Design an enzyme around this catalytic site. Structure first.
Site, PDB file in Angstrom:
ATOM      1  N   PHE A 153     -11.417  42.962  46.025  1.00 55.67           N
ATOM      2  CA  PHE A 153     -10.718  41.707  45.729  1.00 55.67           C
ATOM      3  C   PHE A 153     -11.617  40.457  45.690  1.00 55.67           C
ATOM      4  O   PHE A 153     -11.195  39.415  45.196  1.00 55.67           O
ATOM      5  CB  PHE A 153      -9.508  41.498  46.659  1.00 55.67           C
ATOM      6  CG  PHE A 153      -9.863  41.388  48.116  1.00 55.67           C
ATOM      7  CD1 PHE A 153      -9.738  42.491  48.957  1.00 55.67           C
ATOM      8  CD2 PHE A 153     -10.318  40.184  48.654  1.00 55.67           C
ATOM      9  CE1 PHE A 153     -10.067  42.400  50.302  1.00 55.67           C
ATOM     10  CE2 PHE A 153     -10.653  40.088  50.007  1.00 55.67           C
ATOM     11  CZ  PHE A 153     -10.533  41.199  50.828  1.00 55.67           C
ATOM     12  N   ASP A 154     -12.845  40.551  46.195  1.00 56.55           N
ATOM     13  CA  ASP A 154     -13.737  39.387  46.222  1.00 56.55           C
ATOM     14  C   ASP A 154     -15.171  39.828  46.458  1.00 56.55           C
ATOM     15  O   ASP A 154     -15.411  40.881  47.041  1.00 56.55           O
ATOM     16  CB  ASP A 154     -13.288  38.414  47.324  1.00 56.55           C
ATOM     17  CG  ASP A 154     -13.852  37.004  47.159  1.00 56.55           C
ATOM     18  OD1 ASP A 154     -14.586  36.728  46.178  1.00 56.55           O
ATOM     19  OD2 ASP A 154     -13.541  36.168  48.024  1.00 56.55           O
ATOM     20  N   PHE A 166     -14.890  44.818  54.760  1.00 55.38           N
ATOM     21  CA  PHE A 166     -15.900  43.903  54.232  1.00 55.38           C
ATOM     22  C   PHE A 166     -17.302  44.485  54.397  1.00 55.38           C
ATOM     23  O   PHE A 166     -17.644  44.999  55.459  1.00 55.38           O
ATOM     24  CB  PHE A 166     -15.842  42.544  54.934  1.00 55.38           C
ATOM     25  CG  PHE A 166     -14.658  41.704  54.558  1.00 55.38           C
ATOM     26  CD1 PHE A 166     -13.457  41.833  55.243  1.00 55.38           C
ATOM     27  CD2 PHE A 166     -14.751  40.765  53.533  1.00 55.38           C
ATOM     28  CE1 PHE A 166     -12.362  41.052  54.909  1.00 55.38           C
ATOM     29  CE2 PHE A 166     -13.662  39.964  53.203  1.00 55.38           C
ATOM     30  CZ  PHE A 166     -12.461  40.111  53.886  1.00 55.38           C
ATOM     31  N   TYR A 173     -21.012  38.808  50.962  1.00 55.80           N
ATOM     32  CA  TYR A 173     -19.956  39.748  51.299  1.00 55.80           C
ATOM     33  C   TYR A 173     -19.246  40.273  50.076  1.00 55.80           C
ATOM     34  O   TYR A 173     -19.236  39.637  49.006  1.00 55.80           O
ATOM     35  CB  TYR A 173     -18.913  39.108  52.235  1.00 55.80           C
ATOM     36  CG  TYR A 173     -17.982  38.120  51.540  1.00 55.80           C
ATOM     37  CD1 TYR A 173     -16.760  38.534  50.978  1.00 55.80           C
ATOM     38  CD2 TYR A 173     -18.321  36.773  51.450  1.00 55.80           C
ATOM     39  CE1 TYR A 173     -15.918  37.622  50.330  1.00 55.80           C
ATOM     40  CE2 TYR A 173     -17.487  35.861  50.812  1.00 55.80           C
ATOM     41  CZ  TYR A 173     -16.287  36.290  50.260  1.00 55.80           C
ATOM     42  OH  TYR A 173     -15.476  35.374  49.641  1.00 55.80           O
ATOM     43  N   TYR A 223      -4.955  39.258  57.752  1.00 57.50           N
ATOM     44  CA  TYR A 223      -3.846  38.416  57.261  1.00 57.50           C
ATOM     45  C   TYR A 223      -2.450  38.873  57.688  1.00 57.50           C
ATOM     46  O   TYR A 223      -1.447  38.261  57.312  1.00 57.50           O
ATOM     47  CB  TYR A 223      -3.927  38.215  55.738  1.00 57.50           C
ATOM     48  CG  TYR A 223      -5.211  37.539  55.319  1.00 57.50           C
ATOM     49  CD1 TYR A 223      -6.276  38.281  54.816  1.00 57.50           C
ATOM     50  CD2 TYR A 223      -5.364  36.165  55.464  1.00 57.50           C
ATOM     51  CE1 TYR A 223      -7.480  37.663  54.447  1.00 57.50           C
ATOM     52  CE2 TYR A 223      -6.553  35.538  55.104  1.00 57.50           C
ATOM     53  CZ  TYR A 223      -7.596  36.294  54.598  1.00 57.50           C
ATOM     54  OH  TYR A 223      -8.768  35.671  54.246  1.00 57.50           O
ATOM     55  N   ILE A 233     -10.953  34.574  59.314  1.00 52.78           N
ATOM     56  CA  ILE A 233     -10.110  35.574  59.986  1.00 52.78           C
ATOM     57  C   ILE A 233     -10.797  36.096  61.249  1.00 52.78           C
ATOM     58  O   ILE A 233     -12.028  36.086  61.340  1.00 52.78           O
ATOM     59  CB  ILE A 233      -9.679  36.726  59.040  1.00 52.78           C
ATOM     60  CG1 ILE A 233     -10.899  37.397  58.381  1.00 52.78           C
ATOM     61  CG2 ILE A 233      -8.714  36.183  57.996  1.00 52.78           C
ATOM     62  CD1 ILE A 233     -10.603  38.636  57.561  1.00 52.78           C
TER      63      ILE A 233
HETATM   64  C1  LIG Z   1      -8.456  26.222  50.998  1.00 51.51           C
HETATM   65  C2  LIG Z   1      -9.407  27.101  50.140  1.00 51.51           C
HETATM   66  C3  LIG Z   1     -10.631  27.604  50.954  1.00 51.51           C
HETATM   67  C4  LIG Z   1     -11.510  28.477  50.083  1.00 51.51           C
HETATM   68  C5  LIG Z   1     -12.856  28.556  50.102  1.00 51.51           C
HETATM   69  C6  LIG Z   1     -13.733  27.757  51.044  1.00 51.51           C
HETATM   70  C7  LIG Z   1     -13.559  29.514  49.147  1.00 51.51           C
HETATM   71  O1  LIG Z   1     -14.706  28.881  48.535  1.00 51.51           O
HETATM   72  C8  LIG Z   1     -13.954  30.811  49.912  1.00 51.51           C
HETATM   73  C9  LIG Z   1     -15.177  31.534  49.274  1.00 51.51           C
HETATM   74  C10 LIG Z   1     -12.749  31.787  50.095  1.00 51.51           C
HETATM   75  C11 LIG Z   1     -12.414  32.682  48.864  1.00 51.51           C
HETATM   76  O2  LIG Z   1     -12.226  31.860  47.688  1.00 51.51           O
HETATM   77  C12 LIG Z   1     -12.284  32.589  46.443  1.00 51.51           C
HETATM   78  C13 LIG Z   1     -11.236  33.670  49.121  1.00 51.51           C
HETATM   79  O3  LIG Z   1     -11.781  34.651  50.029  1.00 51.51           O
HETATM   80  C14 LIG Z   1     -10.966  35.830  50.171  1.00 51.51           C
HETATM   81  O4  LIG Z   1     -10.941  36.536  48.920  1.00 51.51           O
HETATM   82  C15 LIG Z   1     -11.778  36.631  51.163  1.00 51.51           C
HETATM   83  O5  LIG Z   1     -12.602  37.455  50.785  1.00 51.51           O
HETATM   84  C16 LIG Z   1     -11.632  36.470  52.612  1.00 51.51           C
HETATM   85  O6  LIG Z   1     -10.730  37.142  53.089  1.00 51.51           O
HETATM   86  N1  LIG Z   1     -12.420  35.639  53.348  1.00 51.51           N
HETATM   87  C17 LIG Z   1     -13.500  34.874  52.710  1.00 51.51           C
HETATM   88  C18 LIG Z   1     -14.843  35.184  53.414  1.00 51.51           C
HETATM   89  C19 LIG Z   1     -14.738  34.957  54.945  1.00 51.51           C
HETATM   90  C20 LIG Z   1     -13.585  35.816  55.523  1.00 51.51           C
HETATM   91  C21 LIG Z   1     -12.233  35.538  54.803  1.00 51.51           C
HETATM   92  C22 LIG Z   1     -11.630  34.234  55.277  1.00 51.51           C
HETATM   93  O7  LIG Z   1     -11.387  34.089  56.465  1.00 51.51           O
HETATM   94  O8  LIG Z   1     -11.388  33.288  54.354  1.00 51.51           O
HETATM   95  C23 LIG Z   1     -10.884  32.030  54.853  1.00 51.51           C
HETATM   96  C24 LIG Z   1      -9.364  32.059  54.907  1.00 51.51           C
HETATM   97  C25 LIG Z   1      -8.655  32.382  53.606  1.00 51.51           C
HETATM   98  C26 LIG Z   1      -8.742  31.803  56.076  1.00 51.51           C
HETATM   99  C27 LIG Z   1      -7.252  31.774  56.337  1.00 51.51           C
HETATM  100  C28 LIG Z   1      -6.844  30.301  56.583  1.00 51.51           C
HETATM  101  C29 LIG Z   1      -5.319  30.236  56.822  1.00 51.51           C
HETATM  102  C30 LIG Z   1      -4.969  31.100  58.061  1.00 51.51           C
HETATM  103  O9  LIG Z   1      -3.544  31.020  58.246  1.00 51.51           O
HETATM  104  C31 LIG Z   1      -5.381  32.583  57.873  1.00 51.51           C
HETATM  105  O10 LIG Z   1      -5.032  33.287  59.091  1.00 51.51           O
HETATM  106  C32 LIG Z   1      -4.672  34.661  58.893  1.00 51.51           C
HETATM  107  C33 LIG Z   1      -6.902  32.661  57.566  1.00 51.51           C
HETATM  108  C34 LIG Z   1     -11.430  30.894  53.938  1.00 51.51           C
HETATM  109  C35 LIG Z   1     -12.978  31.001  53.893  1.00 51.51           C
HETATM  110  C36 LIG Z   1     -10.928  29.491  54.412  1.00 51.51           C
HETATM  111  O11 LIG Z   1     -11.577  29.101  55.631  1.00 51.51           O
HETATM  112  C37 LIG Z   1     -11.084  28.352  53.375  1.00 51.51           C
HETATM  113  C38 LIG Z   1     -10.243  28.474  52.132  1.00 51.51           C
HETATM  114  O12 LIG Z   1      -9.294  29.247  52.062  1.00 51.51           O
HETATM  115  C39 LIG Z   1      -9.524  35.456  50.645  1.00 51.51           C
HETATM  116  C40 LIG Z   1      -8.526  36.654  50.632  1.00 51.51           C
HETATM  117  C41 LIG Z   1      -8.922  34.278  49.822  1.00 51.51           C
HETATM  118  C42 LIG Z   1      -9.919  33.092  49.712  1.00 51.51           C
HETATM  119  O13 LIG Z   1      -9.431  32.029  48.861  1.00 51.51           O
HETATM  120  C43 LIG Z   1      -8.429  31.191  49.461  1.00 51.51           C
END
Ligand SMILES: CC[C@@H]1/C=C(\C)[C@@H](O)[C@H](C)C[C@H](OC)[C@H]2O[C@@](O)(C(=O)C(=O)N3CCCC[C@H]3C(=O)O[C@H](/C(C)=C/[C@@H]3CC[C@@H](O)[C@H](OC)C3)[C@H](C)[C@@H](O)CC1=O)[C@H](C)C[C@@H]2OC
EC number: 5.2.1.8
Length: 107
Positions: free
Chosen positions: A36-37, A99, A26, A82, A56
């Site tokens: 951003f990623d 995405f 992605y 978010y 999400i």
């Molecule tokens: C604890 C660290 C742990 C980090 C890893 C496993 C890393 O290895 C991953 C490669 C994630 C990336 O790390 C660089 C980075 O990805 C972003 O850049 C991104 O592109 C993104 O949006 N993604 C990631 C790809 C799937 C969709 C989405 C997501 O759903 O991500 C999920 C997410 C953040 C969910 C929120 C959880 C809290 C709720 O309250 C909120 O509800 C609204 C939703 C993410 C996968 C989590 O399950 C697990 C984590 O966060 C985020 C902008 C910030 C995030 O970093 C934190």
């Protein structure tokens, strides 16, 4: 919600089910186009399990609509992303996200 617009077709047969691990590449950007990623830049496919509240809502419901091999653009309203909270310093409050997602395989 989430809009799913196909870039390239998948097999049209193999869709992810609750309890299966989706393996994807992605890239994520804000509505204005600012990237951003990217799992591609990280050189590592991203894995998540459907039905485990790991991602999400826009992903949970958008990726569920994809079949293995498919590449799609997911346009996601803040409420399926978010929301008013954002993601500190990465995603501003009230952000629509875009995405590019490719569903590589299921595990
Ligand atoms: C604890 C660290 C742990 C980090 C890893 C496993 C890393 O290895 C991953 C490669 C994630 C990336 O790390 C660089 C980075 O990805 C972003 O850049 C991104 O592109 C993104 O949006 N993604 C990631 C790809 C799937 C969709 C989405 C997501 O759903 O991500 C999920 C997410 C953040 C969910 C929120 C959880 C809290 C709720 O309250 C909120 O509800 C609204 C939703 C993410 C996968 C989590 O399950 C697990 C984590 O966060 C985020 C902008 C910030 C995030 O970093 C934190």
């Amino acid at each position: 919600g989430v809009q799913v617009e196909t870039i390239s077709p998948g097999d049209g047969r193999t869709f992810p089910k609750r309890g299966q691990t989706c393996v994807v590449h992605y890239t994520g950007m804000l509505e204005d186009g600012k990237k951003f990623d990217s799992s591609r830049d990280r050189n590592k496919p991203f894995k998540f399990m459907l039905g485990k509240q790991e991602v999400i809502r826009g992903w949970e419901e958008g990726v569920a609509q994809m079949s293995v091999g498919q590449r799609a653009k997911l346009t996601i309203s803040p409420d399926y992303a978010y929301g008013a909270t954002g993601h500190p310093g990465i995603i501003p409050p009230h952000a629509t996200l875009v995405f590019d997602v490719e569903l590589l395989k299921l595990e």
